[PDB]
Design a binder for this molecule. Structure first.
Ligand SMILES: CCCCCCCCCCCCCCCC(=O)O
Ligand SMILES: CCCCCCCCCCCCCCCC(=O)O
Ligand SMILES: [Fe+3]
Ligand SMILES: [Fe+3]
Ligand SMILES: [Fe+3]
Ligand SMILES: [Fe+3]
Lengths: 285, 285
């Protein structure tokens, strides 16, 4: 429906708003372009590998590529809901959030193209637990906001997207990439991309913390809802992590070749740490 | 609802898609930051003016500030509709479109703040015709896409937003700013912003041409709909232009002071030219 008026005609941007400040930082720190990354060495690395070694890296890339695409599509309802609420500074920031995720989709798709696996269907490495999070729960929670923008709905959406998908899974994925391939000296272009992604992710997670905390600040009983929604998704998080771990343990040729002692118990504890850490960044009071 | 799968897992980005190419150009040409513009001379210019001269520049700024804010909010339904249709490259491009409009909102709001009119309510310079376009028709046409993404609905939305608001009014506004203030040597910061806006606008209009043409290409009877929707809005376009012209003719102190022979008949013909020119960029066949 209609606009009743416009904030930048009646007044100005709220220059001191936390999300205006986050928007300003995003513009300053968000200049990187996936089209500038040199993937030539990645191509050679991947070709050098045996078929067994080649397969090793793909489950993780499969999880990220679909994840970036899901979040690019599924952030749009949040931008709409906050826009309808007149939260202009949040919307300005969210334009940087969405543009970041677009570059993340682009970065992984360029890597796949470059190393010669674009024609390969990597959906085979999404198990039921992954599908429950990314094919179902994420888009359910975000799309709800089109018809229900209650504090309850907004907390559930920020929890699944910013605190679980980004703050638990994506963060653990970046850590895993560096623990495995940065050590091996493999895929320098991909690891350059991962570093830029991990920098962007910082702002995405901070938006989710801001959003969940400002709702909790109104009524501390929303804190219990946050914790509950975090716990509801945990079985699928660890169920996916456990599935990737088993794939990893079954095809170890890459680790042998490159002298990597991949401690899967250390990666598993990192996921658990991330999850608990995100819980602690929200204050009940 | 759920994702059935993901294009960048099954395959890759369509690298040859026109909107992927437009997205790539947006990243290359879209680096400018309103926070870097030096408005110090603008502040001094505005303070130097008499109250009568001060008032001269504000109707145009009022029209732009509200316009940028409306389009920042009202592009979100188009991104959603194309996302739901699986048009991934269009969505990637649209993240740059939305982020551009956010910077446009920011740029005018920084100028208002800097010259000392942020506290002034400029809604007084929106007449009924302006309100019909920006407070009503624009958001009606875009929001429709949430429940009706038929070719008819998508053509009406691209027509009002890209071909009328951007391709006719915004373009004519940029031309007007340069005809008046660039001549006077006034407001260098604002005119630097206008140049960056006008560069961005090129891509926005090209998205609308692409969108309307790909629908017309399917069925040439959609051409008649395009023309009809262009004509429906014309009375409000010229009605706003005529209102600004009369304000201009009533307070001429700025033009006298700075030796500007502001040909309002030339600006009016420029609007008419723009409108007819946009019609001609769509081919029936
Ligand atoms: C065995 C170690 C487990 C590591 C967990 C790997 C997680 C891979 C899936 C990542 C999903 C990516 C979500 C992207 C979110 C975003 O782009 O903001
Ligand atoms: C007297 C000369 C008439 C000139 C017409 C001035 C138009 C001013 C209003 C501009 C609306 C701005 C719309 C912004 C669109 C966008 O930012 O993409
Ligand atoms: Fe991402
Ligand atoms: Fe993210
Ligand atoms: Fe604009
Ligand atoms: Fe525009």
């Amino acid at each position: 429906v209609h606009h009743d008026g416009f904030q930048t005609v009646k007044a100005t941007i709220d220059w001191e708003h936390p999300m205006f400040k986050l928007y300003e930082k995003a513009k300053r720190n968000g200049k990187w372009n996936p089209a500038d990354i040199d993937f030539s060495q990645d191509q050679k690395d991947f070709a050098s590998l045996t078929s067994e070694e080649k397969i090793s890296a793909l489950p993780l890339v499969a999880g990220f590529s679909a994840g970036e695409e899901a979040v690019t599509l599924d952030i749009l309802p949040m931008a709409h809901a906050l826009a309808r609420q007149g939260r202009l500074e949040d919307v300005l920031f969210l334009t940087t959030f969405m543009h970041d995720e677009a570059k993340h989709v682009e970065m992984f798709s360029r890597w796949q193209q470059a190393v010669g696996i674009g024609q390969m269907d990597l959906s085979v490495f999404h198990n039921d637990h992954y599908k429950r999070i990314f094919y179902e729960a994420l888009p359910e929670a975000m799309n709800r906001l089109y018809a229900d923008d209650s504090p309850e709905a907004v907390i559930r959406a920020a929890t699944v997207y910013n605190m679980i998908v980004e703050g638990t899974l994506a963060e653990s994925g970046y850590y895993t990439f560096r623990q495995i391939y940065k050590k091996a000296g493999l895929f320098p272009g991909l690891l350059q991309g991962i570093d830029y992604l991990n920098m962007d992710e910082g702002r995405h997670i901070q938006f989710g913390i801001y959003t969940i905390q400002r709702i909790v600040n109104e009524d501390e009983r929303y804190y219990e809802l946050f914790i509950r929604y975090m716990d509801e998704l945990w079985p699928h998080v660890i169920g996916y992590v456990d599935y990737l771990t088993e794939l990893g343990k079954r095809q170890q040729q890459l680790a042998r070749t490159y002298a990597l002692e991949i401690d899967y118990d250390l990666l598993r504890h990192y996921v658990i740490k991330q999850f608990n850490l995100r819980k602690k960044q929200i204050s009940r009071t």
